[PDB]
């Protein structure tokens, strides 16, 4: 998955 | 509300202890009792928020994950039938995480974002608010997620046009929205190229802009442009 | 009984595939539902039950570790004071834990160690009802803390003699329940000669035994023994 | 703190 903050 | 006879203050003071004690669930419902309070939320409050509700969102999106992969193996041909019990755990949690995205998207709604007036408040607010949509997305089905997607969209689309209007492109809340709108435009969307020019817009428009800052700025925004670029990595 | 209305397979299930999603709150649930139909628990089942609540109640001592760490800074001489926050939270995940330990102990008083009777079973219950009483022994003070505390004893006595005369040095339950009743002994019993010397004669004998296994059990029963040798590290 | 299964 992508990072999402 | 279970909160209301807890001052705001102490509801602050134990969402701090919870934190340290890794009891997202609880931290959550203390900020949750605090917002209901009614007054408007600093910019450590709404980092508590927001982290300890991205923390139990977090955890129930993992666990559908994995109860998904499962539920769809299941469902491939060749596969035994074991009956109804994994699409309905799979639902209980989805469930669940429902549950925590109409709590998060209540509070915002009332009335977190119509006091909201500063840009580091307001874009915070849509930003969250465009996330919890996401999050339904991720376990919406057919027409249904498409209004929750356009309602994803539109809050980030406003947040991002207050952003450029009124913040540095270093600015933490800045990058953190136009990396989960990129997200959103790659994961929910099906936009790849807007993910893609997104992310490297962001992050050249950022890097122009480093030699602003004091040290400790410059990492918190070298930080998230990181992540900028361990996406497009990850997509190109 | 919030499961009494779904079967005892599908709770089975439904404990697996939360366990899978680190799910353990929702598997300690459906285990309870489980062991509520009535019926005697195969080994995998009661392995199922006890992975559950040990992770259950593994986050609320962790959790409470954390928070009774900074409520003895903030009642040592000089610390400012933050008023009874800390106390009362630590209070709530204290009584959430004694809950849990509760439930734990009434699900094995009604009815599980009645109706076990062969060691493999009754041994895991006895070693089970020890421990429990010792997480309740972690957070009591007193005379209440005594009466736990031989309870946990009495528990774990039990439990041992039982194992020495039905189960070989190497079973891993009898290894485990040594494990943790020499930790009762260090950490609880305020007994550390005795804490060592059981694991040293546990581990010595089980070495003398391993001869006797298959290559699966001999990694079993060995990756016990080497967490003797830890403790005996730590402690010596 | 020591290792207990
Ligand atoms: C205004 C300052 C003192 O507070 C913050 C700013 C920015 C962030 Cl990201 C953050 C996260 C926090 C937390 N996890 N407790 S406090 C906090
Ligand atoms: C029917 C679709 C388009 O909308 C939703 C689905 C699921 C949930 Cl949980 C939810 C919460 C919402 C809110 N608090 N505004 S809208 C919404
Ligand atoms: C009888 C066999 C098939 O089941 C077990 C034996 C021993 C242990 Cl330790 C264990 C842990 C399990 C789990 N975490 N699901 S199943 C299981
Ligand atoms: C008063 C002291 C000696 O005993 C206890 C304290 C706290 C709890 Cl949670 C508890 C649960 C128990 C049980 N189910 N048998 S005894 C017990
Ligand atoms: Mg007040
Ligand atoms: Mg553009
Ligand atoms: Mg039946
Ligand atoms: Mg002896």
Redesign the pocket.
């Given at each position: 998955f992508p990072a999402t903050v | 509300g279970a909160m209301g006879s807890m001052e705001r203050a102490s509801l602050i003071q134990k969402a701090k202890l919870a934190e340290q004690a890794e009891r997202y669930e609880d931290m959550a419902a203390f900020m949750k009792g605090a917002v209901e309070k009614g007054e408007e939320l600093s910019c450590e409050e709404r980092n508590l928020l927001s982290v300890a509700y991205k923390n139990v969102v977090g955890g129930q999106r993992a666990a559908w994950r994995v109860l998904s992969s499962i539920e769809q193996k299941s469902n491939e041909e060749g596969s035994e039938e074991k009956g109804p019990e994994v699409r309905e755990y799979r639902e209980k949690v989805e469930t669940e995480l429902?549950?925590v995205?109409?709590t998060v998207?209540?509070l915002l709604?009332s009335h977190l974002i119509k006091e909201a007036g500063d840009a580091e408040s307001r874009v915070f607010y849509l930003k969250m608010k465009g996330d919890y949509y996401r999050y339904?997305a991720e376990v919406?089905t057919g027409d249904?997620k498409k209004?929750?997607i356009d309602?994803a969209r539109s809050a980030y689309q406003e947040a991002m046009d207050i952003s450029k209007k009124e913040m540095p492109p270093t600015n933490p809340i800045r990058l953190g929205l136009a990396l989960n709108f990129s997200v959103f435009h790659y994961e929910i969307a099906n936009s790849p190229e807007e993910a893609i020019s997104l992310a490297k817009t962001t992050f050249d428009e950022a890097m122009a802009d480093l030699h602003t800052l004091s040290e400790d700025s410059y990492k918190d925004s070298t930080l998230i442009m990181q992540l900028l670029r361990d996406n497009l990595t990850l997509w190109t």
């Amino acid at each position: 998955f992508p990072a999402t903050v | 509300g279970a909160m209301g006879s807890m001052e705001r203050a102490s509801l602050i003071q134990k969402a701090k202890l919870a934190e340290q004690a890794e009891r997202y669930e609880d931290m959550a419902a203390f900020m949750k009792g605090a917002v209901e309070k009614g007054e408007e939320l600093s910019c450590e409050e709404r980092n508590l928020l927001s982290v300890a509700y991205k923390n139990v969102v977090g955890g129930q999106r993992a666990a559908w994950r994995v109860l998904s992969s499962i539920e769809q193996k299941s469902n491939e041909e060749g596969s035994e039938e074991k009956g109804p019990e994994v699409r309905e755990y799979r639902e209980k949690v989805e469930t669940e995480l429902q549950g925590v995205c109409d709590t998060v998207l209540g509070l915002l709604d009332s009335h977190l974002i119509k006091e909201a007036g500063d840009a580091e408040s307001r874009v915070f607010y849509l930003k969250m608010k465009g996330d919890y949509y996401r999050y339904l997305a991720e376990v919406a089905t057919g027409d249904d997620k498409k209004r929750i997607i356009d309602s994803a969209r539109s809050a980030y689309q406003e947040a991002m046009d207050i952003s450029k209007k009124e913040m540095p492109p270093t600015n933490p809340i800045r990058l953190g929205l136009a990396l989960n709108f990129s997200v959103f435009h790659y994961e929910i969307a099906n936009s790849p190229e807007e993910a893609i020019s997104l992310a490297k817009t962001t992050f050249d428009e950022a890097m122009a802009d480093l030699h602003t800052l004091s040290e400790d700025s410059y990492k918190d925004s070298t930080l998230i442009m990181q992540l900028l670029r361990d996406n497009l990595t990850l997509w190109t």
